[PDB]
Amino acid sequence: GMKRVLLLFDVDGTLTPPRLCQTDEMRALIKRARGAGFCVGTVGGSDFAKQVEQLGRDVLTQFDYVFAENGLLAYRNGLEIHRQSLLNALGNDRIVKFVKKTLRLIADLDIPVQRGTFVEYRNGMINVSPIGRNCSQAERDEFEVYDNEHRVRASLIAELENSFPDFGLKYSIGGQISFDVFPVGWDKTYCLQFVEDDFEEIHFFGDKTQEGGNDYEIYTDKRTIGHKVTSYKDTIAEVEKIIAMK
Ligand SMILES: [Mg+2]
Numbered sequence: 001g002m003k004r005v006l007l008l009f010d011v012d013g014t015l016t017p018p019r020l021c022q023t024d025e026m027r028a029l030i031k032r033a034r035g036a037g038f039c040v041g042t043v044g045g046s047d048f049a050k051q052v053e054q055l056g057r058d059v060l061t062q063f064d065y066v067f068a069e070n071g072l073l074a075y076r077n078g079l080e081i082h083r084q085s086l087l088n089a090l091g092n093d094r095i096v097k098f099v100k101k102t103l104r105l106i107a108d109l110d111i112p113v114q115r116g117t118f119v120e121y122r123n124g125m126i127n128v129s130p131i132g133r134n135c136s137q138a139e140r141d142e143f144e145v146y147d148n149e150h151r152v153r154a155s156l157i158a159e160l161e162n163s164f165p166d167f168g169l170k171y172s173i174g175g176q177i178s179f180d181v182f183p184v185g186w187d188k189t190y191c192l193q194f195v196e197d198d199f200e201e202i203h204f205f206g207d208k209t210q211e212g213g214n215d216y217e218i219y220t221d222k223r224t225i226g227h228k229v230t231s232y233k234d235t236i237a238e239v240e241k242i243i244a245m246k
Contacts, residue, residue, distance in 0.1 A: 003037040003246070006065070006199040007239060008191075008224070010206035010215060011044040012175060014235050016054050019140070019176065022232070029236050030062060036243050039199065041065030043191050045174040045214050047122055048073055070182070071191025072124030081194060084124035089183045094167060095121075098181075101163050102128055105156055111146065113139050124190075125182040130156060133178065144176040153179050174214045188218035196223050203242065205229050 009015050016022045030040055040063050042051060048068040051059050059066055066075040074082035086095065099119050106118045109130055116134035120127040127133070130152050131143040147153055157171040157179060170187060173179045188206075195202060204224040206215030219226040229235045 001037060002039070004198075004200045005037075005242075006039045006041055006195055006202045007033060007242065008041045008043055008065070008067075008195075008202055008204045008218075009235065010208075010229075011042055011046065011051055011054055013207050013231065014205050014229055015042070015232055017232060019137075020054070022055050025236065026232055027062070029239055033239055033243060034064070036246060038242070039064040041067060041191075041195070043067040043071060043188050043204075043218065045070055045125075045172060045180045045188070047127075065191075065195065067188075067191035067194075069122050069125050070180075070186060070188045071194060072122070072182070072186060074191060074194050076194070084186070084190075086121070086124050086126065086182070089124075089186070090167070095126075098160075098164060098167065098169075099126070102126075102156075102160065105159055106130060109152065109156075111143070111150075111152060113143065115139070120178075124186055125180050127178050127180050128156065128160075129178040131177050135177065140176045147177075172214045174208075180214075188215065189221045189223075192218070192221060192223050201225055203227060205235050205238065 012019060015026055033040055042063055044051060051068060060075055060078045064077055072084040102119050111130060113131055113135060115132035118129055118132045120133060153173050168184050169181050170184050171179055171181055202224050204218050205227045206219060207229055208215040209219040209228045210216060218224060227238050
């Protein structure tokens with residue numbers, strides 16, 4: 001029967017090659033785990049659209065749980081089970097204050113490329129991109145390199161932290177071009193409230209598992225058995241072992 005065991009995965013770098021679609025062997029492994037009685041889930045700091053892009057249009061069919069924006073938008077077997085609102089935690093006046101400041105800081109930057117969708121208001125979070133989410137893949141690659149050198153995202157977060165220390169927001173770098181901003185506690189552990197009562201074990205797999213990494217809280221949550229991975233191949237090999245010990 002069903003194992004009452006959830007396998008919860010990061011997307012980019014955990015289920016996929018870096019900034020690429022999931023491969024055929026990843027899809028096969030997932031189906032084998034599901035075939036063996038495990039539930040499988042995604043969790044990412046990115047939006048649902050991004051998971052569709054890297055995993056497929058039928059992502060809700062492939063996974064038991066899909067947690068976008070850290071579980072601030074949550075799906076269970078095709079059903080939307082939760083959708084949080086940043087207005088609920090922060091409220092209009094503070095949001096407007098925050099996005100205004102962010103826009104000025106971005107406008108002041110001197111980076112080689114800027115495009116569009118610098119401040120993205122999601123469900124329960126705001127995502128902030130110095131270059132803008134509307135840049136091309138090649139532009140993303142180049143901003144990532146640039147940011148490695150010049151730490152543009154870190155400077156920006158530093159300035160935002162100075163402007164708004166009382167806002168109590170967390171700033172979480174992730175992927176090539178942006179960082180997420182959300183209330184303390186709306187990190188990836190947010191999704192666990194939706195599964196904790198339904199599994200005897202929850203295994204988490206991710207790569208950014210240390211202090212300041214966007215997988216730190218969820219890795220170190222007492223509710224999860226953490227598996228630090230460095231690639232989707234690492235993920236596969238560890239899931240093979242979990243399947244073997246059924
Ligand atoms: Mg844990």
